[PDB]
Amino acid sequence: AGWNAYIDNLMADGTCQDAAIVGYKDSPSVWAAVPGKTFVNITPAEVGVLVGKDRSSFYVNGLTLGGQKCSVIRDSLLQDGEFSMDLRTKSTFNVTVTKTDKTLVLLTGKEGVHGGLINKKCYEMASHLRRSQY
């Protein structure tokens, strides 16, 4: 399938334990993801927080992704050219969320996997989608 091929890309190595593509326009929903994981259960309320205008409250408190509580280490999701938010779960795995024109690309590496490489991998996927006018 179309979008599912992109997940197989992100999960090709054993590092990343979960990944997803989620449309956030109009009515949010998962476009592609890893079955039996967490991102498959992301809610549009959680999506509204990610792309929200209040970007100081998920710092103190943190947000959730598919119910999975996470802290925030870095937020540049609304920054053009950068469009990424780095996260770390509250057990801990490192997470990166990137924003395209129509989607959110989410990815979390397994235990011990550096959040920097996760950011590079996730930023690479969103950069590709952006050029595909997505």
UniProtKB/Swiss-Prot annotation:
Q: How is it modified after translation?
A: Phosphorylation at Ser-132 reduces its affinity for G-actin and blocks its interaction with HTT, reducing its ability to inhibit androgen receptor (AR) and HTT aggregation.
Q: Has the keyword Ubl conjugation been applied to this entry?
A: yes
Residues bearing Phosphoserine are S27, S56, S84, S132
| Tissue-specific expression | Expressed in epididymis (at protein level).
User: In its keyword annotation, does this UniProt entry include Nucleus?
Assistant: no
Q: Which GO terms describe its molecular function?
A: actin binding; actin monomer binding; adenyl-nucleotide exchange factor activity; cadherin binding; phosphatidylinositol-4,5-bisphosphate binding; phosphotyrosine residue binding; proline-rich region binding; RNA binding
Record-level GO BP terms = actin cytoskeleton organization; modification of postsynaptic actin cytoskeleton; modulation of chemical synaptic transmission; negative regulation of actin filament bundle assembly; negative regulation of actin filament polymerization; negative regulation of stress fiber assembly; neural tube closure; positive regulation of actin filament bundle assembly
Identify the InterPro entries for this entry: PFN, PFN_euk, PFN_sf, Profilin1/2/3_vertebrate, Profilin_CS
Quote the SUPFAM superfamilies the UniProt record gives: Profilin (actin-binding protein)
Which residues does the record list as N-acetylalanine (modified residue)? Answer: A1
Task: Enumerate the subcellular locations listed in this protein's record, separating them with semicolons.
Answer: Cytoplasm, Cytoskeleton
Which SMART domains does the protein's record reference? Answer: PROF
Cross-link Glycyl lysine isopeptide (Lys-Gly) (interchain with G-Cter in ubiquitin), where in sequence: K53
Q: Name the UniProt key words of this record, in alphabetical order.
A: Acetylation, Actin-binding, Amyotrophic lateral sclerosis, Cytoplasm, Cytoskeleton, Disease variant, Isopeptide bond, Neurodegeneration, Phosphoprotein, Ubl conjugation
Write out the function statement from the record. Answer: Binds to actin and affects the structure of the cytoskeleton. At high concentrations, profilin prevents the polymerization of actin, whereas it enhances it at low concentrations. By binding to PIP2, it inhibits the formation of IP3 and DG. Inhibits androgen receptor (AR) and HTT aggregation and binding of G-actin is essential for its inhibition of AR.
Which disease? Amyotrophic lateral sclerosis 18: A neurodegenerative disorder affecting upper motor neurons in the brain and lower motor neurons in the brain stem and spinal cord, resulting in fatal paralysis. Sensory abnormalities are absent. The pathologic hallmarks of the disease include pallor of the corticospinal tract due to loss of motor neurons, presence of ubiquitin-positive inclusions within surviving motor neurons, and deposition of pathologic aggregates. The etiology of amyotrophic lateral sclerosis is likely to be multifactorial, involving both genetic and environmental factors.
The similarity comment for this entry is: Belongs to the profilin family.
Q: How does it assemble?
A: Found in a complex with XPO6, Ran, ACTB and PFN1. Interacts with ACTB. Interacts with VASP. Interacts with HTT. Interacts with SH3BGRL. Occurs in many kinds of cells as a complex with monomeric actin in a 1:1 ratio. Interacts with ACTMAP.
Q: What is this protein called?
A: Profilin-1
Q: Which organism is it from?
A: Homo sapiens (Human)
